């Protein structure tokens, strides 16, 4: 009788890009808007 | 109107007028501050 250990899943993480970058600042948020849709891409990937 | 109701917000997030069955993260909730606070030291003498 022998064991075989296999990972199946890992931790499901989510990151509010706009809060990691601009915690609660609205100047920084308005300034990050001009980078387009990077944050949406990142959140989409992590959700997948 | 993206801020009328959750369904409209989902429609804006997906950028569509039809939403398939599922669960979508549309925004981030966070508590807003109730009031502001200032705590400076009790100093009175003006700088010379």
Swiss-Prot record, chain A:
Which part of the entire sequence is included in the shown chain? Answer: 722 to 769 of 1273
Listed as disulfide-bonded, the cysteine pairs are 17-39, 22-28
Q: What is this protein called?
A: Spike protein S2
Q: What is the lineage of its organism?
A: Viruses, Riboviria, Orthornavirae, Pisuviricota, Pisoniviricetes
Q: What does this protein do?
A: Precursor of the fusion protein processed in the biosynthesis of the S protein and the formation of virus particle. Mediates fusion of the virion and cellular membranes by functioning as a class I viral fusion protein. Contains two viral fusion peptides that are unmasked after cleavage. The S2/S2' cleavage occurs during virus entry at the cell membrane by host TMPRSS2 or during endocytosis by host CSTL.
UniProtKB/Swiss-Prot annotation, chain B:
Q: Report which gene this protein is encoded by.
A: S
Complex formation: Binds to host ACE2. RBD also interacts with the N-linked glycan on 'Asn-90' of ACE2. Cleavage of S generates a polybasic C-terminal sequence on S1 that binds to host Neuropilin-1 (NRP1) and Neuropilin-2 (NRP2) receptors. Interacts with host integrin alpha-5/beta-1 (ITGA5:ITGB1) and with ACE2 in complex with integrin alpha-5/beta-1 (ITGA5:ITGB1). May interact via cytoplasmic c-terminus with M protein. May interact (via N-terminus) with host bilirubin and biliverdin, thereby preventing antibody binding to the SARS-CoV-2 spike NTD via an allosteric mechanism.
Q: Which residues are glycosylated?
A: 34, 36, 42
Can you tell which superkingdom this protein's organism belongs to?
A: Viruses
Spell out the protein name for this chain. Spike protein S1
Disordered: region residues: 30-46
* Disulfide-linked positions: 2-12
Q: What does this protein do?
A: Attaches the virion to the cell membrane by interacting with host receptor, initiating the infection. The major receptor is host ACE2. When S2/S2' has been cleaved, binding to the receptor triggers direct fusion at the cell membrane. When S2/S2' has not been cleaved, binding to the receptor results in internalization of the virus by endocytosis using host TFRC and GRM2 and leading to fusion of the virion membrane with the host endosomal membrane. Alternatively, may use NRP1/NRP2 and integrin as entry receptors.
């Amino acid at each position: 009788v022998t064991t075989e250990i296999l990972p199946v899943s890992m931790t499901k993480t989510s990151v509010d890009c706009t809060m990691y970058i601009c915690g609660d600042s609205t100047e920084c948020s308005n300034l990050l808007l001009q980078y387009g849709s990077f944050c949406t891409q990142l959140n989409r990937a992590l959700t997948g | 109107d993206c801020a009328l109701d959750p369904l409209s917000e989902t429609k804006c997030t997906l950028k569509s007028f039809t939403v398939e069955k599922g669960i979508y993260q549309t925004s981030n909730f966070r508590v807003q501050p109730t009031e502001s606070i200032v705590r400076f030291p009790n100093i009175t003498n003006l700088c010379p």
